[PDB]
């Protein structure tokens, strides 16, 4: 059917707004099963009123249109963001126009992101940054506790626990890209493949950070996960959590590892990066994703120190690689053994000099390449993703073949 908004009360003072699409809307590897998805927003309306995670650009108008019929936006006290990017920021611009009195609640990395993203926008709602174990009291027992859960792809990711309802708002964790009529997740098997595919595409390349996240979240006795995507997790909560632990364990246990350094979390190059990573991990080789923009030097050193191969992904900005790609390049060259397998990819408009620069520097530095350098002009398509995935697989096979020779 057409996109819609499914509304359901889910706990005291708490409502979910599921923006639903039955069709795939973006060419990103995680929508590969083409089972649709949902973008979930949550409203806690107590003494104070908080809205979690307005949906992105595809959903902006249905969502705001629907919300306004259920709520005077002038009474909105808080907008809580589990993660931030330009797509979500688009909806925020409109929502905050209608709710100028609201305060933005988010993590420190998200705040930094949002300040750039809304730099030229008129909206100037205040931002209140939340750190681990900070609280926000909505009244009526809804004293929220916040838990930062950063990953390369979601540097500003922030989970929230509501002790009144025992709901953990988990953002990108524990979800599934599947559109259905069920607001809750009764039935294990129908969601198993979606949940595993979701983990594999989104979380496997961040196995250590995701494990660190789940360790923190253990401290909260939640009976429901309220994720960004798919049904709420109530009936499958324990089983899915045990599965995540096992999957995380097997990722970090794999013999070979690839350091996958890409320029930033969101954008065409990032889309390519997730596709390549999935090709590697499905082939039984671990991936440590590195967001050059938000990563520090020790992260990059440690990744390169334990990897069998590394891959750079970069856009071209004014004829050059982004500064974070240039500095990551220096750290990589200063630390990588020439036995490491190398790879280069990227997207570009009409100039792709960043890709040429990287290919040349790695070739001059004596590295062998694990796939032919990937150059994608303008927006990735379905076959783009499959090609990148296949390149990742090729890279993985090359690593396994060379390792078997010891
Ligand atoms: Cl984020």
From Swiss-Prot:
The keyword Transport is assigned to this record: yes
Signal peptide per UniProt: none
Keyword Heme applies: no
CC cofactor note: Binds 2 iron ions per subunit.
UniProt keyword list: Electron transport, Oxidoreductase, Transport
Flavodoxin-like domain sequence ranges: 258-396
E.C. designation(s): 1.-.-.-
GO molecular function term, any single one: oxidoreductase activity, acting on the CH-NH group of donors, NAD or NADP as acceptor
Source domain of life: Bacteria
Class of enzymatic activity (EC top level): oxidoreductase
Region Zinc metallo-hydrolase, annotated ranges: 34-229
Cofactor(s), names only, from the UniProt record: Fe cation
UniProt family annotation: In the N-terminal section; belongs to the zinc metallo-hydrolase group 3 family.
Miscellaneous: By homology with NorV in E.coli, may be involved in nitric oxide detoxification.
Function: Mediates electron transfer from NADH to oxygen, reducing it to water. This modular protein has 3 redox cofactors, in other organisms the same activity requires 2 or 3 proteins.
UniProt protein name: Putative diflavin flavoprotein A 3
Designated gene of the protein: dfa3
